[PDB]
Amino acid sequence: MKKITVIDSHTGGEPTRLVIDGFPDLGRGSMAERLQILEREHDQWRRACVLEPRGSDVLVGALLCQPQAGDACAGVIFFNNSGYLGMCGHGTIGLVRSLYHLGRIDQGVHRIETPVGTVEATLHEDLSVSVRNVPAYRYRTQVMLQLPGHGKVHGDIAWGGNWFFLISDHGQRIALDNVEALTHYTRDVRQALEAAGITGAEGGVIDHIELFADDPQADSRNFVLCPGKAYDRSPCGTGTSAKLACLAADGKLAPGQAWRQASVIGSQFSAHYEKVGEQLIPILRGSAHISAEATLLLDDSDPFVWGIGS
Amino acid sequence: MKKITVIDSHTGGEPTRLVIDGFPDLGRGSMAERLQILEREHDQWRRACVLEPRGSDVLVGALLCQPQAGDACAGVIFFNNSGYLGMCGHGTIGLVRSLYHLGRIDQGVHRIETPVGTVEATLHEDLSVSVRNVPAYRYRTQVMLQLPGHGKVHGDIAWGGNWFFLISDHGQRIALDNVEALTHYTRDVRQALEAAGITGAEGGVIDHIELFADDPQADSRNFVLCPGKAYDRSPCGTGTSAKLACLAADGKLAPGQAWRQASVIGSQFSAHYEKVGEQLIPILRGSAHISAEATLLLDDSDPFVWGIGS
Numbered sequence: 001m002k003k004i005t006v007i008d009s010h011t012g013g014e015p016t017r018l019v020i021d022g023f024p025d026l027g028r029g030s031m032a033e034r035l036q037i038l039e040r041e042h043d044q045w046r047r048a049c050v051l052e053p054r055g056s057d058v059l060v061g062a063l064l065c066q067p068q069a070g071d072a073c074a075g076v077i078f079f080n081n082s083g084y085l086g087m088c089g090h091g092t093i094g095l096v097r098s099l100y101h102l103g104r105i106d107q108g109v110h111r112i113e114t115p116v117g118t119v120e121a122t123l124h125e126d127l128s129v130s131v132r133n134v135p136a137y138r139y140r141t142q143v144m145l146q147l148p149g150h151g152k153v154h155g156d157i158a159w160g161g162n163w164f165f166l167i168s169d170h171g172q173r174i175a176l177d178n179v180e181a182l183t184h185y186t187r188d189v190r191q192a193l194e195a196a197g198i199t200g201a202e203g204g205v206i207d208h209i210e211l212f213a214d215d216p217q218a219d220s221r222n223f224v225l226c227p228g229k230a231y232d233r234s235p236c237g238t239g240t241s242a243k244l245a246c247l248a249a250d251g252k253l254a255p256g257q258a259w260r261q262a263s264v265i266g267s268q269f270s271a272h273y274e275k276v277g278e279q280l281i282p283i284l285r286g287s288a289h290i291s292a293e294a295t296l297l298l299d300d301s302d303p304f305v306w307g308i309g310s
Numbered sequence: 311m312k313k314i315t316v317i318d319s320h321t322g323g324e325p326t327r328l329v330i331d332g333f334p335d336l337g338r339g340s341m342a343e344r345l346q347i348l349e350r351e352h353d354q355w356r357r358a359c360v361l362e363p364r365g366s367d368v369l370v371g372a373l374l375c376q377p378q379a380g381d382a383c384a385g386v387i388f389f390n391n392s393g394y395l396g397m398c399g400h401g402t403i404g405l406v407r408s409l410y411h412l413g414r415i416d417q418g419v420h421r422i423e424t425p426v427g428t429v430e431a432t433l434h435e436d437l438s439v440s441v442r443n444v445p446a447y448r449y450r451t452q453v454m455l456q457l458p459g460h461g462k463v464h465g466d467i468a469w470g471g472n473w474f475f476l477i478s479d480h481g482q483r484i485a486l487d488n489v490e491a492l493t494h495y496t497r498d499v500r501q502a503l504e505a506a507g508i509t510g511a512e513g514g515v516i517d518h519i520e521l522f523a524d525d526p527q528a529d530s531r532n533f534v535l536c537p538g539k540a541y542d543r544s545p546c547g548t549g550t551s552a553k554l555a556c557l558a559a560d561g562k563l564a565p566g567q568a569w570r571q572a573s574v575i576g577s578q579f580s581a582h583y584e585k586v587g588e589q590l591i592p593i594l595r596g597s598a599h600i601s602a603e604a605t606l607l608l609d610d611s612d613p614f615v616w617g618i619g620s
C-alpha cells in the first residue's frame with residue numbers, strides 16, 4: 001500500500017484535498033513546470049487522489065509543493081476529475097486554513113506560488129482568508145451563442161485565473177434543487193462554444209461556465225460548471241474574479257467596492273478589486289473548515305487503485 | 311473538534327465508511343433497537359458522516375457496534391445519503407476486510423449482527439469475503455408497470471435484506487457511460503411503484519430498483535438505484551440475493567450453483583444459495599480494498615458541520 005497523506009477541507013461546501021506527502025517528486029522548477037511533469041509522467045496519481053473510489057467527481061485536489069522563492073510559504077498545483085486547473089480561489093483558502101491546522105503558518109500575510117503566478121493570502125484573526133489573486137480581465141463581451149431549445153444567449157469571456165464564460169440572460173433558476181437542469185444547460189453552452197470555435201486569448205479553452213442571478217441576500221448568486229462537469233459548491237474564487245473584471249469594464253463596480261457573491265448552495269464570498277496600472281487585481285475573502293485528516297492507501301491488488309472510469 | 315474515526319474501503323468500487331469511534335452511544339439493545347435510537351436521536355451524525363462535504367451522495371456508512379451475542383465478532387448499522395439500510399452485502403465485505411486491516415480479526419468465519427438478523431462472513435486466504443446473508447424470497451412476480459414515455463414493464467418484488475424491484479424487460483443499455491439515463495429510468499420506475507401503491511410484504515417500501523441485462527463475461531450485468539438516488543457501483547449484495555431468489559423460483563438456478571453478477575462498472579460478485587427448510591439462503595463472495603484511514607473533524611463554526619442540503 002503506497003500512502004498519500006492529505007488534509008481534506010471545504011470552502012463554502014466545495015472540497016479541497018491537500019496532498020502533503022506521497023506524490024512523486026516533480027523537481028525544482030516553477031509550479032507551471034512541475035504541473036507539466038505531473039500531468040505527463042504521473043497523471044495516474046491525480047486519478048488515484050481525486051476520482052472514485054478514493055475521491056469523488058466533486059473533489060478538487062491541491063498538491064503542496066516547496067516553492068522556488070524564499071519569501072513564499074508554499075507552492076501548489078490544483079487539479080480536478082478531468083485535469084488541471086490554473087489558479088483556484090476556494091482551493092487557496094483551503095490550503096492556507098490547512099497549513100494553519102498543521103501548525104506550519106500563523107495568522108498574517110503569505111505568498112503562494114501557482115502555475116499562473118504568485119498570489120498573496122491573508123489569514124485573518126477570524127481564520128477567514130483573503131486571497132489577492134493574479135490579474136483578471138475581460139477578453140470579449142456579449143458574445144452571442146445559439147442554444148438549441150433555448151435560443152440566443154450572450155456571454156462575456158474573461159480570465160480570473162481560469163477561463164470563464166459568464167452569462168446573465170440564461171433564464172434558468174439558480175438553486176441547489178435545480179442543479180440537474182443547470183448542469184445540462186451549462187454543458188450545452190460549452191458544447192456551443194466548442195462548436196463555434198470560441199476561445200479565450202491565444203486559443204484558451206473556455207472550460208468553466210458560470211450563470212449569474214439576483215439574490216435577496218447578496219449582490220448575486222451563481223452556478224459554476226467546472227471542466228469535469230461537476231459544479232462548484234462555492235462562489236468560485238477565480239470565477240468571481242472574472243466577474244469583477246466584467247462588472248468593472250461595464251462601469252458597475254469601482255476599485256475597493258465590496259461585492260457579495262453567493263453560491264448555488266448559499267455559501268458566500270466577499271470580493272473587491274484594486275487597480276494597478278492597466279491591471280485589475282481581484283481580492284476574494286471566504287472561510288474554509290477542516291473536513292478530515294486522512295491517509296489514502298493504494299493497494300496494488302485493487303483493480304481501481306488508479307481510479308474508476310474513463 | 312468532535313472527531314469521527316473511520317476506515318474507508320470500497321467493494322468493487324462501491325464505498326463503505328466504517329465508523330470505529332466517535333458516534334453517540336446507542337445502548338446495549340439489538341442492532342435493530344440501536345438503529346431506532348440512532349435515527350430518532352442522532353440522525354445529524356449520519357448526515358455529518360456521509361453527506362457532503364465530508365462524505366458524498368454515493369457513500370454508504372457502517373457504524374461498528376459491540377454485538378449482543380458473545381460469539382459474534384461485531385454488530386453493524388448501515389446507512390446512506392437518504393436514511394438507513396437493512397443488510398448491506400458490499401458493506402459487510404468492506405467491514406470484514408476493514409476489521410482485518412485493523413488487526414481485530416484473522417482469516418476464518420465470523421458472525422455479524424445486523425438490524426435484519428445475524429449474517430456469517432468468511433474471510434478467505436485471498437482476503438475475499440463470503441457473506442452468508444439473511445434469507446431471501448420473492449414476494450410477487452411479473453408485476454405490471456406503466457412507464458410514461460416507455461410503458462410497460464414487468465418486475466419481481468423480492469427481499470434480499472432490503473426490498474427490490476427487479477426488471478429484465480426494460481430495453482435500457484447497462485453501462486457506466488449511460489448511468490444518467492439509467493438513473494432517470496429507475497427513478498420513474500420507483501415513481502410508478504409509489505403511484506400504484508405497490509409495496510413488499512406488510513407495506514414494505516420498495517426503495518431499491520434493479521435492472522438486469524446479459525453480459526459477455528458474467529451471467530448478468532445490473533444497474534441498481536439505491537434509496538437516495540445514487541447507484542451502487544458494486545453488483546449489490548442484497549440486490550443479487552434477491553435475484554437468486556427470483557431465479558430459483560423461476561426454475562433457473564438450483565442450490566449450490568454459481569451465479570456471476572457484474573455491476574454497471576464491471577466489478578463482479580459470485581453467488582449461490584443453499585436451501586434450508588422453506589428458506590433460501592443467499593451466499594455472496596467479493597473483495598474489498600482499503601481506501602483510506604481517516605479522522606473526520608466536526609468544526610462547530612462550520613455552517614455545514616452536520617452536512618449540506620435537504
Ligand SMILES: O=C([O-])c1ccc[nH]1
Pocket residue numbers: 014060085087088089090091162226232234235236237238239
Ligand atoms: O475557486 C475556484 O477558483 C475554483 C475553480 C474551480 C473550482 N473552484
Ligand SMILES: O=C([O-])c1ccc[nH]1
Pocket residue numbers: 324370395397398399400401472536542544545546547548549
Ligand atoms: O451491497 C448491498 O447489499 C447494498 C445495498 C445498498 C448498497 N449496497
Ligand code: NA
Pocket residue numbers: 214215216217218219220
Ligand atoms: Na441582492
Ligand code: NA
Pocket residue numbers: 524525526527528529530
Ligand atoms: Na453471459
